[PDB]
Amino acid sequence: LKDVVTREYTINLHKRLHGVSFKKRAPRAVKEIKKFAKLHMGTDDVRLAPELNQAIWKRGVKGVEYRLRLRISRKRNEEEDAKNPLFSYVEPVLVASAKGLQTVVVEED
């Protein structure tokens, strides 16, 4: 029943994609998010909401947004669970601007 915390973060993807080849900009942005979720939630199994992949790829392979306000939920797998007992789910946050925000724990109701 523990380790089911969901938080909201802003990831500075501009910093992480600095100098990256333009055709590997968006594809690596997905990998950075999984790396970002692994750092915060301790999960190798990280799932991306299809809406989030849309936000990363919204302006093409190369025009990744500088900051993404995102929600990462650490949840449990079921139905003959795999090796990982926990996986982190990342879904986009609908916000006017992703700037100036702080990471907050958001209740899962």
Applying CB under 7 A, the residues found at the interface with RNA are: 5, 7, 9-12, 14-16, 18-20, 27-28, 31, 36, 39-40, 42, 66-67, 99-105
Phi–psi pair at 43, nearest 5 degrees: -115, 130
Residue 79 beta carbon to RNA: minimum distance, rounded to whole angstroms: 26
Burial class (CB within 10 angstroms; exposed 0-12, middle 13-18, buried 19+) of 64: buried
Place of tokens 């990998």: 31
Residue whose CB is less far from RNA, 7 or 79: 7
Residue whose CB is less far from RNA, 4 or 81: 4
Residue 77 beta carbon to RNA: minimum distance, rounded to whole angstroms: 19
Residues contacting residue 109 through CB under 8 Å, at least 6 positions apart: none
In whole angstroms, what is the distance from residue 97 CA to residue 66 CA? 11
